[PDB]
């Protein structure tokens, strides 16, 4: 296998020989250079958006990958015209990533059957279901074409979006400081530390973002994260 070692270790973790399993993913996977600008941005996003109520662990970035799923950029192209495009987190159990990478994020969690994202890394990290003896997880960064957001302060099961709306935003009490947003390849990255959103009567601590069309998502990065738990299990 001429694949870089971090890529080989990622393949081993997600799952034939390595290069044959790699092909099953139908995804191009490259290592982001630790000294690149993408890496700086991504590590700042991780550092700044760990929420204060997620205090069981600290997160350590092991590897950062740039990913491109076959056909996905073409599938996403009509949505690139839409306004409000944002780079957001999505965590999942390691056992789902074979299918995630081959098939993309799919639709079957309190705003109905949708594809869920967060702007706080630790919020998404919890959906890895990592364990004290199982302390490595995978988390995605995806470009999400949010457009006109249906803003909500509590759970609603959405059969369909209200006309004119393209996505749902659950309003958090705490939000990355909008003054610290930066633009990366035409995508807004909300990597500032959390401040009060000013949203007065919302029942969510942190933002949630949901889209109801699988084509509204362009996966861009995959991170391998170490969960450093703060206390022993017993």
């Amino acid at each position: 296998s001429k694949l870089p070692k971090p890529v080989q270790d990622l393949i081993k973790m997600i799952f034939d020989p390595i290069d044959v399993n790699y092909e099953k993913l139908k995804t191009d996977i490259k290592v982001v250079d630790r000294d690149s600008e993408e890496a700086e941005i991504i590590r700042k996003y991780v550092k700044n958006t760990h929420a204060t109520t997620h205090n069981a662990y600290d997160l350590e970035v092991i590897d950062i990958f740039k990913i491109e799923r076959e056909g996905e950029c073409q599938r996403y192209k009509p949505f690139k015209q839409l306004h409000n495009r944002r780079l957001l987190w999505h965590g999942s159990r390691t056992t789902n990533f074979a299918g995630i990478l081959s098939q993309g994020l799919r639709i079957a969690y309190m705003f109905g059957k949708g594809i869920y994202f967060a702007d706080m890394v630790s919020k998404s990290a919890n959906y890895c279901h990592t364990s004290q003896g199982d302390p490595i997880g995978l988390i995605l960064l995806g470009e999400v074409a949010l457009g006109n957001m249906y803003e909500l302060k509590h759970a609603s099961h959405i059969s369909k979006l209200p006309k004119g709306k393209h996505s749902v935003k659950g309003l958090g009490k705490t939000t990355p400081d909008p003054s610290a947003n930066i633009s990366l390849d035409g995508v807004d990255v909300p990597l500032g530390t959390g401040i009060s959103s000013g949203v007065n009567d919302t029942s969510l601590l942190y933002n949630e973002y949901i889209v109801y069309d699988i084509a509204q998502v362009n996966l861009k990065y995959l991170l391998k994260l170490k969960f450093n738990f703060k206390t022993s299990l017993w």
Partner: peptide, 11 residues
């Protein structure tokens, strides 16, 4: 305990 985290996020 993981599910408690989600529940906390939603108050």
């Amino acid at each position: 305990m993981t599910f408690v985290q989600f529940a906390n996020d939603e108050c």
